[PDB]
Subunit: 116 residues, 4 copies
């Protein structure tokens, strides 16, 4: 798992389950290329997005569909989505966890990078 995304709900104190996540990589021409996507599990985790070979140095974007999440819980949110854009592997290979904590008016995101 070179790349893992974790999503948490700060209103209920729970993993955010069945949240849609899209990942893109910036391509040579400044456009965003589709790279991976999925839905978070019961633990709020999305694994199996990429291989060590496919996950090269670059700029990556993680788009989180927060609005559908809230609406499915009966909340009409102010935040439309979250977009986290980061540089990877520029110092050589690392495992990355992109975590996001959601509220209807806020998010926080953290990156944890560890060396294999």
């Amino acid at each position: 798992c070179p790349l893992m995304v974790k999503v948490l709900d700060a209103v209920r104190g729970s993993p955010a389950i069945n949240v849609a996540v899209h990942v893109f990589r910036k391509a040579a021409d400044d456009t965003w290329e589709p790279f991976a996507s999925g839905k978070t599990s019961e633990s709020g985790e999305l694994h199996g997005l990429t291989t060590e070979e496919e996950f090269v140095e670059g700029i990556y974007k993680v788009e989180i569909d927060t609005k559908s999440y809230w609406k499915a819980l009966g909340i009409s949110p102010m935040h439309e989505h979250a977009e986290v854009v980061f540089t990877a592997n520029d110092s050589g290979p690392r495992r990355y966890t992109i975590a996001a904590m959601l509220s209807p008016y806020s998010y926080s995101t953290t990156a944890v990078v560890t060396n294999p």
Copy 2:
């Protein structure tokens, strides 16, 4: 003053000074239209971005150039920027403050909406 941005550096314990901020509004196009921009002052605040007459209902994106801020201090941060996408004024006009807290591997962004 309908839109303000306030930015704090949580690792150095200081306002984040001279940080570039861009604001976009979603067009019927579905395209992000440039709307306003400026730099944070010595207190980490950016006022005067827009006027009541220009800040109509819609979907807005605030992008804070955190990468340039950290690089100017010598630091290679994780993220290219901090951002928030929100719906504005859709139940009458409000004052919006976007509050951002920054570290090199994490950020939070919060929309604070008042009357007053």
Copy 3:
């Protein structure tokens, strides 16, 4: 004004209004001695806790009664309070702003330190 506290509610996108804040200073017997207290205003801000004369070097604790706040809004909170413990004035007098972002299962507290 050497110590200020600013409190934001990240779930409702509002200042946290009428929240009790208590400040302690560690005494020479390692007990937390009561030092100052107040309630946040309509803007989420608490000014006037202490004077330059009374705010000497030491270790201080700021405790924000987040439990009573969430309870008043009909929200079950996790924490009894949000807190920061910091060393103050240990190399010259500074102005300290404690910035707290709140949600029912998450908080952040940041010491913002600035000069004369």
Copy 4:
């Protein structure tokens, strides 16, 4: 485990390793009873603090010795230690992860609470 603590470093974007963590439970004589302690692992995680049988309803404090952690990394921090205080098991038994992200001037803490 009914209780896990995870500690992260926001400056380095890494788990915070060999961080001292003490857990207390508020007693009837409203003193803090020592309850458990340990040091975070290489993943920043501290497991095995308690058992289901011992982890009764109550008010708990998680104290994190952030000062010694920063000092070992050659930083003399303004933040002295974190004290995360919460009610546990008051809606019946749950599993708790208390996560904290550290800077020399700030911290952010989240609780994830799940029902097994």
